[PDB]
Structure 1
Amino acid sequence: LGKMEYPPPGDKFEGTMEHGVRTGKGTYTWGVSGAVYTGDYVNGKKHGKGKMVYPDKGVYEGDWVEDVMQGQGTYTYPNGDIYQGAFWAGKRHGKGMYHYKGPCCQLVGDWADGGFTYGRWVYADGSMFMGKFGGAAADSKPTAGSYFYSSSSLVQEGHFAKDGSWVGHRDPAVGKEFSV
């Protein structure tokens, strides 16, 4: 239970220690910036469920596996965007959903290494795109799939060009909003 502090502002650990090594709930507060962590430990490494406040106010709440964000979690970014889903190696990976705050649009489906690769992108009004997105190499830009626009209820399948020009395979038709 030794509140082992570290004078340089300086660190302030406030938790439990089994003869030095950390294990159990604790609140470690870095002093260089202000990033705090409240959660479990194993061998001193942040492990288990634990909330973190980063220097730039980006908050995280979820699982950690050996000091890195792993498993299920929820991140609130400094601008306001939110992510809920699977982290792996400290990034977005697996299945999850991302909500922008400005446009109020959302991305839902399969991520890969911090970037969005497959699934749906829906707007605030209900319109959506579904299909293969760019990824982390690109900037989550759509690559190949179908657009559904709700106001007109139209559905067009196609892909994009290197310049970003939408290229429709056929003319639009009347359809529904990709509940696949």
Structure 2
Amino acid sequence: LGKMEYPGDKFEGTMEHGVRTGKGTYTWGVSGAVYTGDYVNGKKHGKGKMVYPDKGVYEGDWVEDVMQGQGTYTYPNGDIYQGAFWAGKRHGKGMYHYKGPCCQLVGDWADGGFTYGRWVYADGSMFMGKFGGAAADSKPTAGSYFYSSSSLVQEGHFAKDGSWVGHRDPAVGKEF
């Protein structure tokens, strides 16, 4: 239980032979960020809670002082991501839930951007298909809409203008 202060950062946890091995609550006194969690070889590893200077809160897995594995991030605008992390970004299968529009994105992520899956609205209307990924702003690219008030599905894609181009007429369908 060697509580070490820094010229100011405040560590409060166990140290095994000089370095951090176990649980410890490190506090960045310059940026305001804190980390309460496990440690291997003086670095973040295992699990732990991280709050950031922009009030984003991470709770999940850690591999060598970067966000890895399964985690739950909470963004400063109330958005909540739950799913797979890699290289400190959204990567794998995950679910991003907005706060304002209350819609959500479920499926395959790539390098912080949503690249495949479903985007369901509040009322159950969804767009399912291939999205823009991290290169775009996770914009929809090619797939099919279902609107629940009309109960209509339509397959199509988006042009370079951003306008919907459907490959056929709409049709009565289910929510995929």
TM interval, shorter chain, is: over 0.9
Aligned partners of 2:67, 2:77: CA distance in 1, in Å? 20
Residue deviations 1:122-168 (CA, integer Å, cap 9, x gap): 00000000000000000000000000000000010000000101001
Q: Secondary structure at the match of 1:12?
A: coil
- The runs of at least 4 aligned residues of structure 1 exceeding 3 Å deviation read none
Unaligned runs of 5+ in 2: none
Aligned partners of 1:141, 1:89: CA distance in 2, in Å? 22
Q: Secondary structure at the match of 2:12?
A: strand
Aligned partners of 1:5, 1:69: CA distance in 2, in Å? 25
* TM-align CA RMSD: 0.7
Residue deviations 1:31-84 (CA, integer Å, cap 9, x gap): 002100000000000110100010010000000000000000000000100000
Unaligned runs of 5+ in 1: none
Aligned partners of 2:80, 2:115: CA distance in 1, in Å? 18
Once the two structures are TM-superposed, the CA of residue 14 in structure 1 deviates from its matched residue by 0.4
Under a length normalisation based on structure 2, what TM-score does the superposition of the two structures give? 0.99
Aligned partners of 2:90, 2:80: CA distance in 1, in Å? 12
Under a length normalisation based on structure 1, what TM-score does the superposition of the two structures give? 0.97
2:32 alignment partner, one of 11, 31, 34 = 34
Q: Secondary structure at the match of 2:175?
A: coil
1:3 equivalent in alignment to 2:9: no
Aligned partners of 1:10, 1:88: CA distance in 2, in Å? 30
Q: Which structure 2 residues correspond to residues 21-170 of structure 1 after superposition, within 5 A?
A: 21-170=19-168
Residue deviations 1:74-113 (CA, integer Å, cap 9, x gap): 0000010000000000000000000010000000000000
Q: Secondary structure at the match of 2:133?
A: coil
Aligned partners of 1:174, 1:150: CA distance in 2, in Å? 10
Once the two structures are TM-superposed, the CA of residue 19 in structure 1 deviates from its matched residue by 2.1
Aligned partners of 1:4, 1:81: CA distance in 2, in Å? 35
Aligned partners of 2:143, 2:136: CA distance in 1, in Å? 16
Give the number of equivalent residue pairs: 176
Identity of aligned residues (%): 100
